Write a protein that holds these residues in place. Sequence first.
Motif, PDB file in Angstrom:
ATOM      1  N   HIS A 183      45.560  38.328  49.740  1.00  0.00           N
ATOM      2  CA  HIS A 183      44.819  37.912  48.895  1.00  0.00           C
ATOM      3  C   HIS A 183      45.581  37.748  47.282  1.00  0.00           C
ATOM      4  O   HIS A 183      44.409  37.367  46.196  1.00  0.00           O
ATOM      5  N   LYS A 184      46.830  37.174  47.230  1.00  0.00           N
ATOM      6  CA  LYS A 184      47.120  36.924  46.079  1.00  0.00           C
ATOM      7  C   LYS A 184      47.408  34.831  46.048  1.00  0.00           C
ATOM      8  O   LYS A 184      47.343  35.165  45.076  1.00  0.00           O
ATOM      9  N   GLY A 226      42.579  40.256  43.409  1.00  0.00           N
ATOM     10  CA  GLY A 226      43.511  39.407  43.023  1.00  0.00           C
ATOM     11  C   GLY A 226      43.052  37.494  42.990  1.00  0.00           C
ATOM     12  O   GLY A 226      43.660  36.645  42.075  1.00  0.00           O
ATOM     13  N   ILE A 284      48.364  43.492  42.661  1.00  0.00           N
ATOM     14  CA  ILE A 284      47.219  43.566  42.939  1.00  0.00           C
ATOM     15  C   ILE A 284      47.072  45.012  42.583  1.00  0.00           C
ATOM     16  O   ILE A 284      47.687  45.866  43.617  1.00  0.00           O
TER      17      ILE A 284
END
Lengths: 158, 158, 159, 158, 158, 158, 158, 159
Positions: free
Chosen positions: B40-41, A78, A109
């Motif tokens: 993650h983002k 990410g 992702i």
Amino acid sequence: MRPLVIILMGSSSDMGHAEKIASELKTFGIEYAIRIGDAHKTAEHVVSMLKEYEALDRPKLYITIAGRSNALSGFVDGFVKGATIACPPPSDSFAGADIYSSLRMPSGISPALVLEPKNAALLAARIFSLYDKEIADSVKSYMESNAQKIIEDDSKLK
Amino acid sequence: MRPLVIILMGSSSDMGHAEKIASELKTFGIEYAIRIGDAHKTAEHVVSMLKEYEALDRPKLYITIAGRSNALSGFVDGFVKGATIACPPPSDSFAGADIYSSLRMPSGISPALVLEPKNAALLAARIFSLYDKEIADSVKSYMESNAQKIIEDDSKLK
Amino acid sequence: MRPLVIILMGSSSDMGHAEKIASELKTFGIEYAIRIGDAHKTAEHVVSMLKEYEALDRPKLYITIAGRSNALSGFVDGFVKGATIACPPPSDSFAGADIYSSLRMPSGISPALVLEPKNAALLAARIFSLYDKEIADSVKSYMESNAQKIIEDDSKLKR
Amino acid sequence: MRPLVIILMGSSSDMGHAEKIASELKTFGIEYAIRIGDAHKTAEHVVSMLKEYEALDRPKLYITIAGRSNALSGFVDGFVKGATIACPPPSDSFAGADIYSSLRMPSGISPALVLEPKNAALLAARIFSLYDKEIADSVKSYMESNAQKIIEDDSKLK
Amino acid sequence: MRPLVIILMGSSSDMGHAEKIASELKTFGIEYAIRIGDAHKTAEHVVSMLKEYEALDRPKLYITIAGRSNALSGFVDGFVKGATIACPPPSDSFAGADIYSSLRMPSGISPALVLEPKNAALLAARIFSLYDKEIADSVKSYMESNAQKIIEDDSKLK
Amino acid sequence: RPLVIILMGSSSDMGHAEKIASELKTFGIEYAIRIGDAHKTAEHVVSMLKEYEALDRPKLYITIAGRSNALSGFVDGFVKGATIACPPPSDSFAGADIYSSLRMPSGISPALVLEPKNAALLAARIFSLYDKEIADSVKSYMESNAQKIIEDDSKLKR
Amino acid sequence: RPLVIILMGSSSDMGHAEKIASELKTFGIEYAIRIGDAHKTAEHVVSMLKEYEALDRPKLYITIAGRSNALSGFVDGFVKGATIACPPPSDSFAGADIYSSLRMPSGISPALVLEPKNAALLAARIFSLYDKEIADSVKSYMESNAQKIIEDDSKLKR
Amino acid sequence: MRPLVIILMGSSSDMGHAEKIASELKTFGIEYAIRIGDAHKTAEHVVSMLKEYEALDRPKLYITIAGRSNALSGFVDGFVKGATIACPPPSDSFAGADIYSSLRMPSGISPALVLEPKNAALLAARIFSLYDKEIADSVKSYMESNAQKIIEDDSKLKR
């Protein structure tokens, strides 16, 4: 400049697994870096490292190695611009169920999951090979040699 | 000072699960905040948010909610000082195997895993209750009530 | 008075697992007690023990250790006022499926499940740390040390 | 010439899954082909098709889609020169255990496994992006937009 | 004409498993051939070999042995005219889940799955036995012998 | 004169319990149906078991608890005679709740049976060792089951 | 005067059977140990069960069969009284052989118990419903088990 | 005389599954019989039936269908001379774990396991085809038709 593969593992305990990947990249003539950083415990260390590699103007891939619940592959994926490969170390805990932590990514992702460390290296080579004719030549020899070994094994039999 | 529970979910799609936790905290008289952030983002967004809550001079817990491979609980747990609770949303994909991503933490990352959202709230209350007599009293009423419902169900038979 | 963690295991066969937890609690400066009692075979004994610990005016946690089908963690959690932690011993039988007996509680029974003994100790410490500054300092030193070891490993072994 | 992604599925029953991949490639401005061929039943048809695509002098990826026991991804991967991506359709048969047929490759067969069809497309884009600046630009916008949606969702809350 | 069983394994590493099958066929007086060929890496070699055996004017069966994700059994079964038997080597990886790659065939691909190598040989014999009285007689002796061993074990007790 | 005590953990288990009770009634065996939870209403359960344990008559306990079944072991550890565990069905985690009923320590010995009609039949056949009436009833039941299969064959014979 | 017939499918099951037999002897319960397979020596098994079924005395059958357990159902469908299934342990397919003992159709009702000492204890407690001697023996056994745990606490009390 | 496939199921509840197999055998021109009998509840009935079919001088296969824990396939396989095929009905109970009862045979019990009913019919046809040219011709037409449909789908739907 030449391709680079950054091999990033969550723990020094993963080094054996990482070196298998690195050894195989060396046979394809692909430069690599080997680094250690944990997503959860040393996030800022990981980010600062990724910024350093991301600033290099050369084609790059990251291969991320984390045991147990793998948060590292998604974290790296990410953050960085280009493709990444998840290659978790093997485990038989809960009959291998750590694998689902690498598989079950959110939309957006997209690490490539590969189980075998030689296959993580081969996938990396084949990714570069779309644009790098020297690596394409090396992949051809490697894959042809694998096929020939099998046929020779059969010839020793019939 | 009065306790605070920060309910942090990876996605707006987790809101139904979060609201069950929140509704139950309200019955214990415990203040909550509900927030959205993906490990993650939107890692920087999550860190920024955690710093804001971490600066509050009151006892606090984080309840982390993330579907699929749960990286959020360990991310938060590795950042904040105090205890955290992982309460992933239910899933039947791969026979529920997303649960292993919440279970399999490294040494040094210690979120409390609880499956049922009402139990995530009850655990939070009981954590505060070691020092907060008002919440201890509420927990006592709640658990006594649960037990009396069952005994009543038995007497109601025939 | 200072915090107390009661480590209660279903069988003496679990003592090694309990010791790992106690060892880690000692590093945080947290008093512990180690006890043995089984939910199904010695219920009255377990109840009697829990009544004694419950009467103490000090912050306490119970960490409950039971193999196979874990009935101890829910039994203790249903009895005591405050929070509890389940930390079952590891098993590879049926691919680790004993874990579901610790996971699948009814509503109203809320033990914290943690797999690793060092993590059960850390969670306990972090629960007290919401109100106890000295334990919070210890937790911070511990967690910083873990991080620094990883960074040091990278500094040595990086190529 | 421009990149090409060949989406090859084992059955017309996979077309829904394939079109999700194709739709997403279209948002990255990546040309695709959609084809049908079964490894076991129509091997020669598959080989003749792969020879045709392999002869094109342009960067190419194959995304292979096969339900049940996936033999197609490995078959394609052992034939073509460059990288491939396995993106099997979802199944809950035997609690998802068809996934192991995609995972468990021999050394020397290295398809990238990705579960989500939008992630197969994103991985493909990110593979080309190592050398294609226009695709890199598209990936950046896409991934930034995904992060921004989450933050906005949180803003609607706090 | 007398029956032939072609034992085809994906790798020389499968030889121990193959030899258990072969040894048992020898007790039934059934001719065998042992060969090596991988479906993904040496597909043309496998086809060439199958054409040679398929041209023999005698009743024949193929027993296919491949570890990890078994693509070989379906490959062979989709090519040859007559029946085939899948007998994968044992594995404890992922709690044995490689078995699903042999189980989950599409409609139209019908290898007989048998786990134990002695049983793969027994099934082969019993297939021929529908038309070959010599082999039927051997099968009868074999199965009667197995039953008598058990009854004897019982009488031997105390 | 025998008695079967059906004890369930939650009123939600009633439909399951009544399937057991109905079948016991066809065997002419008296039953009681009770509700009580092992963790939440332990004293209520013990007081109840003491009432039953004092009765001078043959008795069995059939214990029904969903999720992680602690009830069967608790009851079994307390009462003198045999008990039967018959958990309600669940698809949660691919039915993994079943292991909480299976994995008893040495010294706790409930009989596990999945089907409620079979819980009743086992109960009957346990009494039938000393109760000629129940034994006659079992014989009639089991003969009826067999005759139905045979008349299905005679009717749907093709 | 009661009798327990321990019937195992293979001489390989002897160690398991003897663990059951030893425990039955501490309960002072007479046993017989026999070998017989449901699929290979069905007539031998039936002839044997007929001998036992004719005896005028309380009896139970404890049936032991590895892999796919057909023996317990076969015996249970034939004999009048209750039976107990106690399969030997296996790690094959993460212990999935257990489902062949669990998944009985309506009308076949063996009691499933995993631990051999518990198979013996269940047998004892079944007789104890009508046998005052065995009941006394059970009470002494189960009290001994409890006292040991308590003296472990008193000794290793910290 | 011509081949015969005996389709034997443990319960009438399996009839739909059996019909799928029989339907496919009819396309290959193979005579079938459909019967019901349970290994544990009606053993003598099953034995009596098997003795009648076994006495026929013609090539035969048995396809055995039993749900839950499959004891029928091994029972029949241990009794009859020639090959048998297990084709259990599908189940999602315990994530499909009933399949292990058909897989895990002792040495000396060798039913062919096939999941799909059409594939059980095709396997049966291909077993007879080792010696029966007419059935071999039918198998070839069948398998060629399957292939041609896939290629035709590609020809239509390719972009």
